[PDB]
């Protein structure tokens, strides 16, 4: 029809006297009729990303990301649903991404990894940690 100029932030005019919140935002009434009404972000993460991932809420949207220690086989850094999830554990030992001391051997774990000592751990540092150092 027409277009109200006074639509509040994150809403768009539906005609000359009304607005509606943009996708990802919500207001008490389905149709806004005054500029005093607000369009608040909807936290989609509080309403499934799938295995080994995390939901991060953003303004107007949200993103699923592989959790730390996992990376997407498909390569897509962000995704929207379980169906697009390609998160697999990162084998830090095979990839040489680990930061183990030359005195230990990298041992892969799901979501992480550790370093094991023949040798014995130096004083004050346990065995089987990322910072393990032996002698
Ligand atoms: C950290 As999760 C796999 O429950 O989105
Ligand atoms: Cl949203
Ligand atoms: Sr949101
Ligand atoms: Sr790992």
Q: How many domains does the chain have?
A: 3
Q: Are residues 107 and 85 in the same domain?
A: no
Find the discontinuities in the chain where C to next N exceeds 2.5 angstroms and give the residue preceding each.
47, 117
Question: In ligand 1, which atom is closest to the CA atom of 54?
Answer: 5
**What method did the depositors use to determine the structure?**
X-ray
Alpha helix (H) ranges present in the chain?
92-95
Q: Measured in Å, how far apart are the chain's first and last C-alpha atoms? A: 79
Residue 110 structure tokens: 């799901």
Chain centroid, CA 69 distance in Å: 12
Q: What is the resolution of this structure in A?
A: 2.5
Q: Are residues 78 and 99 in the same domain?
A: no
Closest CA to 128 of 118, 110, 114: 114
Final residue of a structural domain among 90, 105, 125: 90
Q: Are residues 4 and 16 in the same domain?
A: yes
Tell whether ligand 1 has an atom less than 6 A from the beta carbon of residue 63.
no
Q: List the CATH number of the domain containing 52.
A: 2.10.25.10
Measure the CA–CA gap between 95 and 105, rounded to whole angstroms.
13
Tell me the CA–centroid distance for residue 67 and ligand 1, in Å: 8
Domain of residue 128, residue span: 91-135
């Amino acid at each position: 029809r027409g277009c109200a100029r006074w639509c509040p932030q994150d809403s768009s005019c539906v005609n000359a006297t009304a607005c509606r919140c943009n996708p990802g935002f919500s207001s008490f009434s389905e149709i806004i009729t005054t500029p005093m009404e607000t369009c608040d972000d909807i936290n989609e993460c509080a309403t499934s990303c799938g295995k080994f991932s995390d939901c991060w809420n953003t303004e107007g949207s949200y993103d699923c990301v592989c959790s730390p220690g996992y990376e997407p086989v498909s390569g897509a850094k962000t995704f929207k649903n379980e169906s697009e999830n390609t998160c697999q554990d990162v084998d830090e030992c095979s990839s040489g991404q680990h930061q183990c001391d030359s005195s230990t051997v990298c041992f892969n774990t799901v979501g992480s990894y550790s370093c094991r000592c023949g040798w014995k751990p130096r004083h004050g540092i346990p065995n089987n940690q990322k910072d393990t150092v032996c002698e």
